[PDB]
Ligand binder design. Structure first.
Ligand SMILES: CC(=O)N[C@@H]1[C@@H](O)[C@H](O[C@@H]2O[C@H](CO)[C@@H](O[C@@H]3O[C@H](CO)[C@@H](O)[C@H](O)[C@H]3NC(C)=O)[C@H](O)[C@H]2NC(C)=O)[C@@H](CO)O[C@H]1O
Ligand SMILES: [Cl-]
Ligand SMILES: [Cl-]
Ligand code: NA
Length: 129
């Protein structure tokens, strides 16, 4: 599924991400836009042989199991394919664990390079929340 901007904002808010660990909803929408263009089916391969999955591009070296990343961890205890569903619950629940792991949202490279320090509130402008 390819989400609309306000549709995704409302879904993330319903799942408890607004101000989770101090990160306003606009941060999460901005990260999703530049990680996946709001597409739950997005995948991308990393140089080390791991793969990033879903709307928040969660990496298989650490967070999920895809059966082809030798010597990787599965810290969210889920198949990576679960992160590609039209239902974002699995991606959101894993993201909560990632952002609590010490480095905050700096775990998302596109957030650090394209959202951090910008007016992220503009990503939820006009939405009924
Ligand atoms: C969205 C996504 O998948 N992002 C990936 C990043 O998570 C990943 O960065 C590495 O993440 C691990 C796990 O969070 C980091 O290890 C943690 O580091 C903190 C302090 O730095 C420490 O307190 C934790 O105990 C430790 N956890 C474990 C299990 O060891 C690791 O430092 C991150 N590395 C870097 C360079 O940021 C990166 C790199 O694999 O990929 C993203 O796609
Ligand atoms: Cl915001
Ligand atoms: Cl933080
Ligand atoms: Na893994």
């Amino acid at each position: 599924k390819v989400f609309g901007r306000c549709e995704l904002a409302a879904a993330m808010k319903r799942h408890g991400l607004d101000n989770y660990r101090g990160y306003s909803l606009g941060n999460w929408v901005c990260a999703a836009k530049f990680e996946s263009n709001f597409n739950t089916q997005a995948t991308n391969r990393n140089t080390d042989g791991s793969t990033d999955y879903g709307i928040l591009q969660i990496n298989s070296r650490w967070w999920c199991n895809d059966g082809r990343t030798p010597g990787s961890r599965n810290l969210c205890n889920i198949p990576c394919s679960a992160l590609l569903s039209s239902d974002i619950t699995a991606s959101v629940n894993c993201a909560k664990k990632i952002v609590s792991d010490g480095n905050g949202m700096n775990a998302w490279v596109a957030w650090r390079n394209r959202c951090k320090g910008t007016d992220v509130q503009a990503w939820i402008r006009g939405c009924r929340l």
